[PDB]
């Protein structure tokens, strides 16, 4: 069907590549296969190698490199790639290991990202940037302060957009009076060789006088659209300045994400709720 | 199931005003590029405008830019579109469609803009002093 | 702007015929265009994405491929409830454009 092709500036040297997202079930990661087209003049007696470097940067801490002899030797997909161009196309075909700090990056060069590097070279070049990645697969918090706060979620996964419905339920009993309540998000992404980040909050005036109940549901949604002027921001595995969604929440090397609505009385009692905000497999 | 309803639709003098709902079922303002376009009266489609929340990104057509201005509520799933300076040409009936920003295989595809593959039933707009 | 040119501006056909309509992009197109049969007085209705991909539902008859930024539109068997306009849009670039549309008359 599609396939994704890139040679150097002489051209000697081809990679086809079938995917440029490899999704990690967490058991078995979409093995990187690709082939390699070259002419047998421009390598003679030099070998050619692919790498998958899976760098993390800030600093270059590589995390881990591997290296496959594209010539000499050492899939129906790579098949159907070489029988279009014959016996100078040959496969190369890595295994990611699950434990990788998963594509991500940092919304502005920091970040995590994955590569293709294809080189000829007597002894250990197209350069494809890949990217690792995770499809998505109730809590509740009560508080007594006596000022009780209960806060609780649908449930714990909610997409990317899709908008996140908090049941707020204040029991104030004593005598201070609640000023405002506040639902955000905190997207705690912790660069591990955390930071709170504030991205959506529903302030609403909602005072609840002593003594007395108040309940109902907030709907707050955390967008990228108001998330533009926030460096440090974690992002997705950005391939050549597309753009993204946020770093999705990371399903327990790297950077870590996870996330948690935070609903704070400001009397200032608060409760956390965590979440998860992956993108459904199709 | 997937559905766009289209409302907000009436008489309205030259150099009015109006306002457009497109209530969205199935998806959400913000997994979509929610597109408005109109027909004129036994006339060729003319895409109006199209949004996407998650990204704030808006776009018009460029004899509706400035006119007309797009947007979204992502609490009650709908999208709102709001026509300013109305004017004779403007009268049509208006339709509401959406690119769903999925089928990427993993992602949101930014630059696609695809075709608009769902249409409500489109919301008789008028003008006339 | 892209000036998406269509031919014919109508064409005559009846029951069984190969309807064949060209729309042509006044500047370069990737395979992003659209065709959408418009009944009179319903709302368009999504037929081509990709220059080529069969959206679910079109019925099998109808196709159509690209050959640069000549893209077309075809109809097998155009058969009596597929008469419509046609519009076809390319969605690569902003600001959108549409075609303007071939009317597909009926033949006596």
């Known amino acids: 069907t599609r396939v994704f092709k890139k040679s150097s500036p002489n051209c000697k040297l081809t990679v086809y590549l079938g995917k440029r997202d490899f999704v990690d079930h967490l058991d078995k990661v979409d093995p990187v296969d690709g082939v390699v087209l070259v002419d047998p003049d421009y390598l003679k007696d030099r070998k050619v190698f692919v790498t998958l470097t899976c760098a993390f940067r800030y600093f270059r801490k590589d995390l881990f490199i591997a290296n496959y002899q594209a010539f000499p030797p050492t899939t129906r997909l790579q098949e159907r790639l070489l029988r279009k161009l014959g016996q100078h196309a040959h496969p190369f075909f890595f295994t990611i290991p699950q434990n990788l700090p998963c594509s991500v990056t940092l919304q502005p060069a920091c970040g995590v990202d994955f590569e293709i590097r294809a080189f000829c070279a007597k002894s250990l070049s197209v350069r494809l940037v890949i990217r690792k990645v995770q499809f998505a697969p109730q809590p509740s918090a009560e508080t007594t302060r006596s000022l009780h706060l209960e806060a609780s979620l649908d449930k714990e996964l909610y997409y990317h957009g899709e908008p996140l419905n908090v049941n707020v339920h204040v029991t104030n009993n004593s005598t201070k009076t609640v000023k405002k309540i506040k639902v955000s998000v905190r997207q705690y992404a912790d660069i591990c060789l955390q930071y709170k980040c504030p991205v959506a909050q529903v302030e609403q005036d909602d005072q609840v006088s002593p003594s007395s109940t108040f309940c109902k549901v907030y709907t707050i949604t955390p967008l990228l659209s108001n998330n533009r002027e926030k460096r440090g921001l974690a992002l997705d595995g950005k391939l050549k300045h597309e753009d993204t969604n946020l770093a999705s929440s990371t399903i327990v090397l790297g950077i870590l994400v996870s996330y948690r609505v935070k609903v704070k009385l400001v009397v200032d009692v608060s409760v956390e709720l965590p979440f998860v905000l992956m993108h459904p497999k199709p | 199931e997937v559905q766009l309803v289209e409302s907000g639709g009436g008489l309205v003098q030259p150099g009015g005003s109006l306002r457009l709902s497109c209530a969205a079922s199935?998806?959400?303002?913000?997994?979509?590029?929610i597109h408005w376009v109109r027909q004129a009266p036994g006339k060729g489609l003319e895409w109006v405008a199209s949004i996407s929340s998650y990204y704030g990104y808006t776009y018009y057509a460029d004899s509706v830019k400035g006119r007309f201005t797009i947007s979204a509520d992502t609490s009650k799933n709908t999208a709102y579109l709001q026509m300013n300076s109305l004017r004779a040409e403007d009268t049509a009936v208006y339709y509401c469609?959406?690119?769903?920003?999925?089928?990427?295989?993993?992602?949101?595809?930014?630059?696609?803009?695809?075709?608009?593959?769902?249409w409500g039933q489109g919301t008789l707009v008028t003008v006339s002093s | 702007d892209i000036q998406m040119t269509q031919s014919p501006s109508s064409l005559s056909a009846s029951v069984g015929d190969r309807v064949t309509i060209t729309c042509r992009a006044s500047?370069?197109?990737?395979?992003?265009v659209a065709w959408y049969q418009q009944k009179p007085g319903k709302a368009p209705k999504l037929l081509i994405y990709?220059?080529?991909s069969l959206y679910s539902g079109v019925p099998s008859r109808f196709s159509g491929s690209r050959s640069g930024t000549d893209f077309t539109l075809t109809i097998s068997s155009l058969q009596p409830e597929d008469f419509a306009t046609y519009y076809c849009?390319?969605?690569?670039?902003?600001?959108?454009?549409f075609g303007q549309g071939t009317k597909v008359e009926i033949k006596r």
């Open positions: 849009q390319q969605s690569y670039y902003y600001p959108i454009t």
């Open positions: 199935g998806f959400n303002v913000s997994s979509s590029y």
């Open positions: 469609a959406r690119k769903s920003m999925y089928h990427r295989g993993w992602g949101w595809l930014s630059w696609v803009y695809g075709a608009m593959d769902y």
């Open positions: 990709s220059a080529s």
């Open positions: 500047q370069s197109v990737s395979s992003a």
